[PDB]
Amino acid sequence: CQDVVQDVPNVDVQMLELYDRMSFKDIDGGVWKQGWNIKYDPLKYNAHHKLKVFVVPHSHNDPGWIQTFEEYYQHDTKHILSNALRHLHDNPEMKFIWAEISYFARFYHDLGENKKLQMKSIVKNGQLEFVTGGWVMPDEANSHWRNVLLQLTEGQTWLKQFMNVTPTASWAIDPFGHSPTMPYILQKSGFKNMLIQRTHYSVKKELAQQRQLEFLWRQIWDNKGDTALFTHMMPFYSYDIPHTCGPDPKVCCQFDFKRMFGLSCPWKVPPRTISDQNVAARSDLLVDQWKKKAELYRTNVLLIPLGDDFRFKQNTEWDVQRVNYERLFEHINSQAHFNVQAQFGTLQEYFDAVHQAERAGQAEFPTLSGDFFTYADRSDNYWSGYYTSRPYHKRMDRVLMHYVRAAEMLSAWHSWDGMARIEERLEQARRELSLFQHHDGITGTAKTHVVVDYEQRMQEALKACQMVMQQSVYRLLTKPSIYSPDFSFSYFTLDDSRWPGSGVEDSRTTIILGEDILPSKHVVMHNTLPHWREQLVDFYVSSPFVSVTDLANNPVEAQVSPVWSWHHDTLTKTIHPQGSTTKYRIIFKARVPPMGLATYVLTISDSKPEHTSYASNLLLRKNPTSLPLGQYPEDVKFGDPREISLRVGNGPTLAFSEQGLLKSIQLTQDSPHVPVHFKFLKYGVRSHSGAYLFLPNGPASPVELPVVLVTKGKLESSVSVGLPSVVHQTIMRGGAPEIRNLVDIGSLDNTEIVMRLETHIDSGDIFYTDLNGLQFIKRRRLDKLPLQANYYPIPSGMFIEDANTRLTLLTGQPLGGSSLASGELEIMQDRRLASDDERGLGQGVLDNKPVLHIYRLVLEKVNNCVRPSELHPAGYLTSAAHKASQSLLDPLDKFIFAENEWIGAQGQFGGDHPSAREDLDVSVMRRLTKSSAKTQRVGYVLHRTNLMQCGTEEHTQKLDVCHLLPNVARCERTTLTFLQNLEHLDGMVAPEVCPMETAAYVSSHS
């Protein structure tokens, strides 16, 4: 095994370091606007050192942007691949690369057998080539690493099944910034090489100067060097033909043969058909470009992409590009003076050639670690707005992410008869989720009608996850002797207190109890994590007089709180809460096995149970209306606005300011009231910013201000303020608090609502954000760079720390954030924008809906924690912080029994299940086989995080995922897509995964 805290990795290019050293000066550099005039010695090239040129045709296809997936399919993409099929068939030497399997599958199932076999031919012989082979070309900023794997597996499996192919080269031309989570995943999936485009123009500049655009990209912790994937960064502004042939767009544009008159060259200089008349001169023009570009690479091998957005649509586009290019090649290759071999190639061809050139001693390649955020395409145009854009759907991503994992896991335990339609529903759930991983989905960068389409897809996916989950729970918890299922029937419905969230929609069922009508109700909790988890759960009940027992009929400590619903009187411009008189919240701690189920019973009585406590309700306002709660025991107490100090359990004592905003945290009963000021601030737009670009007009200024609701219970206490736009809540359950905001920006125009945390922590210039919920990276705030440059993705978490203290904020939804000062954390909530970015949308953001954002807040003492070196580019969470994240992203699933009596009800599932070390996670459990298959196969993905040793350790059972199901007959260790066996495990025992490593195993059963 390998240590990731003490031993700082020795890299050629550490990106944080480089960031400290660069000028980031926006120097006009010539025709290559963001570079220089490239000079090459022409006597570099002779017969023994010829230039090898791969011209690589592509179309960039958005699975949704201006148009929906199916719109783009009918209008554009079906034609593209219909021609690719016809042309590559007809033209043996013609090549094409393809990335988006979403469209490829959409096309191939329409094909007519003959067509499928021909499509197979041109794949077999290497003419058509899949690159990455993801369901989509994913966003790398906002996407969770699990969903990155998901989309990958969807596409690559499709490819394995239908095409017999597994791509080992990746292609990422349009993501807005690049994440190291990609090489992490791709290298663990048997990939050999990757390619990126959109990095910061100044980084393109700094790297090109040093011949560092090709590099072995390794993880920020990786000392040993095994995570390292070969990366080709492309050097120019775009992936268009203008920016691909070499440094001069004016030149490059004349070899985009589609442009001769709908399309045209914005350098005024048209392309011209190649003939015997012009060949030699055009050839010279072009070879000079190639050779210029080739100067930026350590080898005499060179990659020339040929295409653009939805290219190769027209039949005649295929001739015009091909024929003209054939003419140039045929010339250049016979003209020995040039010293150039030029041909239509694929991305693998390019890559294999680079390595073959490295075999022949031409180059030794540099090591790089770090990330490629925050991307700027030009001047002070940083793309940090998209970290936040359409935040509803960002939340929705996470919810569905959870529902996918749980539905796959819950149904994994049993083989299912085909009539059950479990496969079909899981297939769809994954696809819809995989689709939203697209760099115009989760980013929030599409048109309104497309965002609508994604929602509908995701809604259907959720509906599908519920069905699979309930059917499964019913099977797992009903005696085999009773189990006699109607696959189409609802045994259970989910309850989700967090999605959409109670302000957002009235979507939660009330359990209706009564002495005559329905005396008691079975509820079931699911725990997807492979450890014992205790967690507070709530349900809506029709009476306060409800007691909780387990199925073993033993009483369970409960709290009843009312059902609060914030109203806005337009009458007053006031944010008042309202009580429900007809429904109540029952809260109790559920204990649930590793990867298991636990049943519970809610029973009514005629009065207060022994073991059910009531919460008091204080409503601080100047001038109250007295407020009925019906049968609720305790009447609402009223008062003038005061400073507050609540505790719950032994877990921390939180002080609140007089308008209900956390003002300090006291950890123990010795520790100081350590100050932590929540503030709300607004940003605006310059007059001198849109769906992609964060363009602020100066520092953020506070929101002008105010009703405060305190609920105080034995299990749970909240503090809830209704400010304009935001209903802010602080919930306390005897650990690190929960922050919920119901954000409605709504009317407020050209505005961006942020959440700041002013602490007296001596962070200085240092903060740490995460990347894809996989890793925490160090960020230095840079005085040189503008504000929006200091904003990073917060997909899951961020933290600041001094020598003694840390404050971590975990999220349940990816947002934008920064530590703009010493002891700050901030994080964007929503953004409404009238102005377009002019990146091709046509709109700003004018479609905002209410969203319930969720957080956790972990203040901690870190002085006796085994801390990484000042030099180390990574951070690592503590137990507390890590569990807080798990609590956000993977909560307990709640199931209410639909009918009146549950004959055959069992109490529990998986009490026999091993309870694995807290730092281990079964990220995926998925059955890989249908019932009508001889051998049942079940894949597992295990991820081991790394946490700070802090003394902090109670013994736990080793988990061997090979033996989680009986009759194991084979356990191979696989690629993360499950598509290739890496290891035969003798004795069918899965070894321990190292910290920061991610393994996948497939177990076979008999």
d(CA 101, CA 117): 18
Q: Which does 839 bind (CB under 5 to 8 A by kind): Zn ion, ligand A1IGC, none?
A: ligand A1IGC
For 254-284, b/e burial (b = at least 16 CB within 10 A) is bbbbbbbeeeebeeeeebeebeeeebeebbe
Residue 568: φ, ψ to 5°: -125, 110
Q: Which range of residues in 59-67, 593-601, 680-688, 904-912 is near ligand A1IGC by CB under 6 A?
A: 59-67
Task: Give the separation between CA 827 and CA 820, rounded to whole angstroms.
Answer: 11
Site for ligand A1IGC in 769-788 (CB under 6 A): none
Does the protein bind ligand A1IGC through residue 439 (CB under 6 A)?
Answer: yes
798: Cβ contacts below 8 Å, ≥ 6 apart = 767, 768, 769, 770, 792, 808, 809, 817, 819, 825, 827
* Interatomic CA distance for residues 178 and 796, integer angstroms: 17
Q: In the stretch 624-653, what mask flags binding to ligand A1IGC with x, by CB under 6 A? A: ------------------------------
Residue 181 — left, alpha, or beta (φ > 0 → left; ψ -120 to 50 → alpha)? alpha
Residue 802 contacts Zn ion per CB under 5 A: no
- Residue 309 lies near ligand A1IGC (rule: CB under 6 A): yes
Q: Which is nearer to Zn ion, 62 or 140 (CB)?
A: 62
In angstroms, the CA 974 to CA 957 distance is 24
Query: Helix 448-477 vs helix 422-435: angle between axes, to the nearest 10 degrees?
Result: 150
Query: CA neighbours within 13 Å on the CB side: how many for 208?
Result: 25
Q: Decide if residue 860 touches Zn ion (CB under 5 A).
A: no
Closest C-alpha among 234, 241, 239, 249 to residue 325: 241
Known binding-site residue numbers for Zn(2+): 60, 62, 174, 439
Name the one range near ligand A1IGC by CB under 6 A: 60-68, 139-147, 500-508, 665-673. 60-68
847: Cα separation from own chain's centroid: 22
User: What are the two backbone dihedrals, phi and then psi, of residue 257, each rounded to the nearest 5 degrees?
Assistant: -70, -5
Paired strand residues for 972: 984, 1002
Residue 408 partner contact from ligand A1IGC, Zn ion, none using kind-dependent CB cut-offs of 5 to 8 Å: none
Residue count, binding to Zn ion (CB under 5 A): 2
Binders of Zn ion in range 50-89 (CB under 5 A): 62
Using the rule CB under 5 A, give the single segment among 24-32, 172-180, 638-646, 716-724 that binds Zn ion: 172-180
* Interface positions, 443-462, toward ligand A1IGC (CB under 6 A): 445
**Is position 68 an interface residue for ligand A1IGC (rule: CB under 6 A)?**
no
Q: How far is the CB of 65 from ligand A1IGC (least distance, A)?
A: 5
Q: Please, which of residues 827-846 interact with Zn ion by CB under 5 A?
A: none
Please say which residue, 309 or 326, places its beta carbon nearer to ligand A1IGC. Answer: 309
The residue among 409, 461, 406, 410 whose CA lies nearest residue 433 is 461
Contact of residue 963 among ligand A1IGC, Zn ion, none (CB under 5-8 Å per partner type): none
Window of 99-107, 168-176, 559-567, 570-578 that interacts with Zn ion by CB under 5 A = 168-176
Is 60 a binding residue for ligand A1IGC by CB under 6 A? The answer is yes
What does 309 bind: Zn ion, ligand A1IGC, none (CB cut-off 5 to 8 Å by kind)?
Answer: ligand A1IGC
Q: Does 390 bind ligand A1IGC (CB under 6 A)?
A: no
Least Å distance between CB 65 and Zn ion? 7
174 lies in the site for ligand A1IGC, by CB under 6 A: yes
- 526 touches, from ligand A1IGC, Zn ion, none (C-beta below 5 to 8 Å by class): none
CB of 249 to ligand A1IGC, least distance (A): 17
The vertex-608 CA angle with 606 and 609, nearest 5°, equals 100
Q: Tokens in use for 605?
A: 């009585």
Neighbours of 915 (CB within 10 A): 20
Minimum distance, C-beta of residue 62 to Zn ion, in the bound complex (Å): 5
Interacting stretch for Zn ion, rule CB under 5 A, among 174-182, 464-472, 571-579, 733-741?
174-182
* Residues between 956 and 975 that touch ligand A1IGC (CB under 6 A): none
Q: Which pair of structure tokens corresponds to residue 996?
A: 């920061």
Cα→Cα distances 898→292, 577, 686, Å? 70, 31, 54
Residue 840 near which of Zn ion, ligand A1IGC, none (CB within 5-8 Å, type-dependent) = ligand A1IGC
Q: How many amino acids of this chain bind ligand A1IGC (CB under 6 A)?
A: 10
Distances (CA, A) of 826 to 36, 52, 677, 728, 960: 38, 50, 11, 15, 41
Q: Closest approach of Cβ 94 to ligand A1IGC, in Å?
A: 24
Which does residue 270 touch among Zn ion, ligand A1IGC, none (CB within 5 to 8 A, set by kind)?
none
Angle at 152 between CA 415 and CA 93, to 5 degrees: 120
Q: Which is nearer to Zn ion, 104 or 978 (CB)?
A: 104
Distance CA(711)–CA(702), nearest Å, equals 27
Q: How far is the CB of 306 from ligand A1IGC (least distance, A)?
A: 17
Contact between 440 and ligand A1IGC per CB under 6 A: yes
Q: Pick between residue 339 and residue 445 the one whose CB is nearest to ligand A1IGC.
A: 445
Dmax over CA atoms of the chain, in Å, equals 100
Least Å distance between CB 661 and Zn ion?
41
| Smallest distance from Zn ion to CB 389, Å | 15
Residues 6+ apart with CB under 8 A from 262: none
CA gap 726, 739 in Å, rounded? 12
Q: What is the 3-state secondary structure (H, E, C) of 67-98?
A: CCHHHHHHHHHHHHHHHHHHHHHHCCCCCEEE
For the segment 399-418, give every residue that binds ligand A1IGC (CB under 6 A): none
Q: Closest distance between ligand A1IGC and the C-beta of residue 97, in Å?
A: 16
Closer Cβ to ligand A1IGC, 839 or 937, answer by number:
839
Nearest residue to 874 (alpha-carbon basis) of 995, 999, 761, 737: 995
206, 507, 669, 858 from 666: Cα distances, Å: 47, 36, 7, 12
Q: Which is nearer to Zn ion, 60 or 475 (CB)?
A: 60
Q: Using the rule CB under 6 A, is 839 a contact of ligand A1IGC?
A: yes
Residue 932 vs residues 140, 416, 825, 935, 969: alpha-carbon distances, Å: 38, 9, 54, 9, 18
Helix intervals (H) in 835-953: 879-889
Handedness of CA 311, 315, 317, 321 (dihedral sign): positive
Stretch that binds ligand A1IGC, among 260-268, 438-446, 503-511, 574-582 (CB under 6 A): 438-446
Q: If binding is defined by CB under 6 A, does position 694 make contact with ligand A1IGC? A: no
Name the binding residues.
Answer: 60, 62, 174, 439
Interaction of residue 62 with ligand A1IGC, rule CB under 6 A: yes
CB of 839 to ligand A1IGC, least distance (A): 5
> If binding is defined by CB under 6 A, does position 716 make contact with ligand A1IGC?
no
| Contact region with ligand A1IGC (CB under 6 A), list: 57-65, 220-228, 804-812, 814-822 | 57-65
CB nearer to ligand A1IGC: pick between 116 and 839? 839
What is the token pair recorded at 959? 């988990």
How far is residue 833 CA from its own chain's centroid?
Answer: 24
CB of 436: closest distance to ligand A1IGC in angstroms?
Answer: 14
- 478 touches, from ligand A1IGC, Zn ion, none (C-beta below 5 to 8 Å by class): none
What single DSSP character describes residue 438? B
Binding of residue 17 to ligand A1IGC (CB under 6 A): no
Catalytic residues: 174
Q: Which residues bind Zn ion (CB under 5 A)?
A: 62, 174
Q: Which residues bind ligand A1IGC (CB under 6 A)?
A: 60, 62, 65, 174, 309, 439-440, 445, 839-840
